[PDB]
Each structure stands twice: as structure tokens, then as C-alpha cells.
Amino acid sequence: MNLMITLLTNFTLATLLVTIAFWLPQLNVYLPFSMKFFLVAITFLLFDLEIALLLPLPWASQTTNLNTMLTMALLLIFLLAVSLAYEWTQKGLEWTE
Amino acid sequence: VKQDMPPVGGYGPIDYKRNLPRRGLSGYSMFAVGIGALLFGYW
Amino acid sequence: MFMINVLTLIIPILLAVAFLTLVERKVLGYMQFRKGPNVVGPYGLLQPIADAIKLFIKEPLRPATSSISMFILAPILALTLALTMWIPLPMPYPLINMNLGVLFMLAMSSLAVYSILWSGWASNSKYALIGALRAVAQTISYEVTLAIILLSVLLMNGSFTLSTLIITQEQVWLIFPAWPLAMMWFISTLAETNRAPFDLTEGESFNVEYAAGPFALFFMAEYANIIMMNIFTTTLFLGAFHNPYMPELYTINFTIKSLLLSITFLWIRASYPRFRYDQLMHLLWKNFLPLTLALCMWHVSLPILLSSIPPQT
Numbered sequence: 001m002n003l004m005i006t007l008l009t010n011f012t013l014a015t016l017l018v019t020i021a022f023w024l025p026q027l028n029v030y031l032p033f034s035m036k037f038f039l040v041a042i043t044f045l046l047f048d049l050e051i052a053l054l055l056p057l058p059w060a061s062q063t064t065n066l067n068t069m070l071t072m073a074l075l076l077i078f079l080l081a082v083s084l085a086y087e088w089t090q091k092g093l094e095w096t097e
Numbered sequence: 098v099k100q101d102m103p104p105v106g107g108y109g110p111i112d113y114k115r116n117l118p119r120r121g122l123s124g125y126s127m128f129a130v131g132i133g134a135l136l137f138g139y140w
Numbered sequence: 141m142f143m144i145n146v147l148t149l150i151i152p153i154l155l156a157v158a159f160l161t162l163v164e165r166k167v168l169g170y171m172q173f174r175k176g177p178n179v180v181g182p183y184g185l186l187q188p189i190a191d192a193i194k195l196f197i198k199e200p201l202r203p204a205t206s207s208i209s210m211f212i213l214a215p216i217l218a219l220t221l222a223l224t225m226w227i228p229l230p231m232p233y234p235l236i237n238m239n240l241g242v243l244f245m246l247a248m249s250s251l252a253v254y255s256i257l258w259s260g261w262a263s264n265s266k267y268a269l270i271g272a273l274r275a276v277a278q279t280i281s282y283e284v285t286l287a288i289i290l291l292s293v294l295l296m297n298g299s300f301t302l303s304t305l306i307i308t309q310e311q312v313w314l315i316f317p318a319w320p321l322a323m324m325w326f327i328s329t330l331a332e333t334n335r336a337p338f339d340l341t342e343g344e345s346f347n348v349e350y351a352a353g354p355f356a357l358f359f360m361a362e363y364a365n366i367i368m369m370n371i372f373t374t375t376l377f378l379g380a381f382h383n384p385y386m387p388e389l390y391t392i393n394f395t396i397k398s399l400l401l402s403i404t405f406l407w408i409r410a411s412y413p414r415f416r417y418d419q420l421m422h423l424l425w426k427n428f429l430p431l432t433l434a435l436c437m438w439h440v441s442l443p444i445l446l447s448s449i450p451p452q453t
């Protein structure tokens with residue numbers, strides 16, 4: 001509730017400052033497609049999904065199945081690294097390396 | 098006469114070569130300090 | 141009474157952003173063997189006020205924009221997200237004490253690329269859109285190491301709670317067990333805010349169609365982001381002493397550390413040339429990301445092998 005008030009206050013202040021900046025000086029009279037950018041955006045998306053898999057780790061370390069948890073955590077970070085290594089060696093990270 | 102001239106003994110030696118003083122620790126010392134900071138933090 | 145607390149957060153944000161411009165011009169003056177602004181105010185203190193009054197009455201640039209709606213929404217979104225990044229910050233107490241404040245900040249900072257994307261598309265210039273796409277690709281690249289470094293650090297915290305991160309650093313700064321994460325974090329926050337040596341929006345090798353007013357709004361959102369990421373880096377790695385009966389000790393201490401870290405941003409822009417675009421892509425994808433994955437494995441496995449798993453609550 002306090003958060004909704006704070007978001008509404010920040011949005012209201014930002015909209016008020018933008019409305020000032022677009023209407024205070026009104027008082028005075030006075031591309032070809034690049035495959036490389038798409039590939040870096042998709043590589044971001046895929047690694048961002050891998051990060052979404054990695055995000056419950058500070059809670060996952062609290063388990064009583066720690067051998068399994070440590071195995072799966074290292075396996076997810078390893079598969080993120082194998083994704084990066086495949087992206088590296090097949091020239092996917094080139095001219096924007 | 099009134100002529101701009103260098104002095105009798107001449108001017109001093111002007112330094113012109115590159116002087117990079119080579120400061121800092123060794124590579125092994127910097128990795129030892131960094132790993133020691135890691136071990137202190139871990140302990 | 142809560143609205144007073146919201147205003148005493150967000151209006152001093154705007155004042156500190158206003159005087160960060162003075163601090164930047166003075167520090168970049170005295171590091172370049174000259175003086176900064178010292179003519180307008182006493183010790184130059186009225187230069188941001190005069191510059192704000194100059195920008196508010198400057199002529200509108202009058203763009204024939206592709207969309208009026210996203211042209212308005214990009215400064216609104218940039219300023220709103222710049223102000224909402226401050227509300228979970230524990231200094232020592234946050235405005236909004238939320239359990240997942242770290243993840244909240246990561247999500248609200250991931251949303252800030254839409255201001256770049258919408259301002260680049262809302263401009264007619266194809267080259268403004270090309271620069272916007274380069275800036276978005278840079279920002280989403282360094283968000284990856286932001287997320288993974290922050291996850292690796294919070295493996296020592298126990299939770300996503302920003303206020304717990306003060307408890308985590310009562311015996312030692314967290315820069316001592318995590319200085320490689322700290323330095324890749326600091327360079328990644330430097331590349332997040334489009335800040336030198338990562339400012340390719342100022343190099344000749346996206347918001348040029350805005351008037352002086354909305355350019356000032358994007359600029360003050362950017363400096364709010366700079367001060368905020370330095371405060372968040374301070375809370376994250378250089379956590380101060382907190383006495384619960386004297387909270388101002390924590391506030392003075394984190395404020396001094398955050399000011400020194402913002403001045404370190406100013407030192408860095410006055411010391412190095414820019415990266416070429418492929419070079420900072422190389423810096424992310426081929427240097428910071430392999431080390432960040434290796435250190436994420438190490439900071440998963442290290443609390444288990446040392447029996448130093450932090451508490452959940």
C-alpha cells in the first residue's frame with residue numbers, strides 16, 4: 001500500500017516534470033538489418049533465462065539435500081558456460097565480441 | 098653588446114629520455130596480497 | 141506522514157543530482173589542471189540553478205516524431221524508474237522495507253532500457269535508432285554480469301533483503317571475500333549508466349531529438365542512476381557500522397563512501413579513453429562473463445565447503 005503510494009508519487013512527479021518541460025517553453029513565441037545486434041539480443045535472452053534458473057540459489061543453499069543441490073547448481077552454471085563456449089567457438093561473439 | 102646569448106659555462110643538462118619509474122609490487126606479491134584478502138574475507 | 145518520508149527521499153535525490161553536475165565539472169576541472177565553474181555562484185554553487193533555468197526556457201527543438209506517445213513516455217519511464225530504484229535502499233532503514241529488494245532493484249534496472257529504445261524509435265533519425273540499439277545491446281549485455289555477480293554475493297547474504305546486507309558485513313566488508321566480484325561489479329555498473337569509458341552515446345565511432353527540458357530529464361535520471369548504483373555498491377561491498385540507537389552514524393558513513401565512489405566515477409571519466417563498441421562487447425562476453433561464471437560456481441561451492449552458509453531469515 002505504501003509501495004503503491006510511492007510508485008504513484010514517483011510517476012506523478014515524473015509526469016509533472018515532463019509536462020513542465022514540454023509546455024513551459026511554449027510560452028515564448030520564438031536502417032539495414034544487422035544480424036549481429038539481433039544475435040547479441042537473443043544471446044542475452046537465452047542467458048537471461050539461464051540466470052532465471054540460477055536466481056533461487058541463496059534459498060537453495062538452505063536445503064538438507066546439499067550434495068544434490070550443489071551438483072545441480074554447478075551443472076546449471078556449467079551449462080551456461082557451455083552455452084558461452086559454443087557461442088565463442090562457432091564465431092557467434094564476433095565483431096561485437 | 099646587447100645580444101641574447103647562452104652563459105659562459107652553458108646551460109645545464111636537459112632531461113629528454115623516457116622516465117617511467119617502475120613502481121608497484123611484483124606479480125607474485127600482488128596475487129599473494131589478493132589471495133590473502135580473499136582468505137581473510139572467507140575466514 | 142509517509143508522504144513526508146517519500147518527499148524527503150525524492151526531493152533530496154533531485155538536489156543531489158543537481159549538485160553532482162557541479163561536483164563533476166569542478167573535479168574534472170581540477171584533474172585537468174584548471175578550475176571548474178567558480179563565477180556564477182560563490183565557489184560556483186549557483187551554476188546548476190542557472191543551467192536549469194537556462195534549459196527550462198530554451199526553445200523546443202520541435203521534432204516531427206514517429207510516435208508522440210513513446211516520445212513522452214521515455215522520459216517519464218526513465219525518471220520514474222530512476223526514482224523507484226531508491227525506495228528499498230537501506231540507509232540504515234529503507235523507505236520500503238521489502239524482502240526481495242535486491243531482485244526488485246535488478247528488475248527495475250532491467251526495465252530502464254525501454255526509455256533508450258522508445259526514445260530511439262520515437263526519433264525520426266535512423267542513426268539515432270542505430271545508436272539506441274547499440275546502447276540497449278550494451279546495457280542488456282552488462283545486466284548479465286550484474287545479475288550473476290549480485291547472485292554470487294548474495295550467496296553470502298542468505299536472502300534478497302537489502303537490510304540483511306548490513307548484518308552480513310558487521311565483522312568485515314564484503315569487498316574482502318569478494319573483491320573480484322566487486323571490481324567486475326563496479327565496471328559493470330559503469331557500463332550500465334553509459335558512463336565513460338563506456339559512453340558511446342558521446343563518441344563519434346540516442347536522445348538528440350528531445351528539447352533542452354526533456355534532455356535535462358534524461359540527464360537527471362542518468363545521474364540519479366549513477367548516485368544510486370554507487371549507493372547500492374556501497375551497501376553491497378562496503379557495508380558500514382550500524383548502531384540501532386544512533387542510525388545517523390550509518391547514514392554519515394554510507395554517505396561518505398557513496399560520495400567517494402561517485403567521485404571515483406568522475407576520476408575514471410577523466411583518466412581513460414573510450415572503448416570501441418566491439419571492445420566492450422569483448423570485455424563483457426569474453427572477459428567478465430567467464431570469470432563471473434567461475435566465481436559464481438566458487439561462491440556456490442564455498443559456503444558449503446567452509447560450513448559458512450548464511451541464514452535465510
Ligand SMILES: CCCCCCCCCCCCCCCCCC(=O)OC[C@H](COP(=O)([O-])OCC[N+](C)(C)C)OC(=O)CCCCCCCCCCCCCCCCC
Nearest residue numbers: 128320322323324326327337373377408412423427428431
Ligand atoms: C567496488 C569498489 C571498487 C572496486 C574496484 C574498482 C576500482 C578500480 C578501477 C580501475 C579503473 C577501471 C576503468 C575501466 C577499465 C575497464 C577495463 C578492464 O578493467 O578490463 C578488465 C580486464 C580485461 O582484460 P584485457 O582486455 O585488458 O586483457 C586482454 C585480454 N585478452 C587476453 C582476452 C585479449 O581484466 C579482466 O577482465 C579481469 C577482471 C578481474 C579479475 C580478478 C581475478 C581475481 C584473481 C583470480 C585468481 C588468479 C590466480 C590464478 C588462479 C589461482 C587459484 C587459487
Ligand SMILES: CCCCCCCCCCCCCCCCCC(=O)OC[C@H](COP(=O)(O)OCCN)OC(=O)CCCCCCCCCCCCCCCCC
Nearest residue numbers: 001003004007011213216217220221224237238239240244
Ligand atoms: C507505460 C506505462 C507507465 C510506465 C511508467 C510507470 C511504471 C514503471 C515504473 C513502476 C514499476 C512498478 C512495479 C510494481 C511492482 C514491483 C514489484 C514489487 O512490488 O516488489 C516489492 C515487494 C516484494 O517484496 P516483499 O517484501 O516480498 O513484499 C512484502 C511482503 N512482506 O512487493 C510488495 O511490496 C507488494 C505490494 C503490493 C502489490 C503492489 C502492486 C503494484 C501495482 C501493480 C503494478 C503497477 C504498474 C503496472 C505497469 C508498470 C509498467 C510495466
Ligand SMILES: CCCCCCCCCCC1=C(C)C(=O)C(OC)=C(OC)C1=O
Nearest residue numbers: 154158161187188191192355356359360
Ligand atoms: C527542476 C530540478 C532540476 C531539473 C534538471 C535541470 C538541472 C540538471 C541538469 C542540467 C545540466 C547541467 C547542470 C550540466 O552541467 C550539464 O552539463 C554537463 C548538462 O548538460 C549535459 C545539464 O543538462
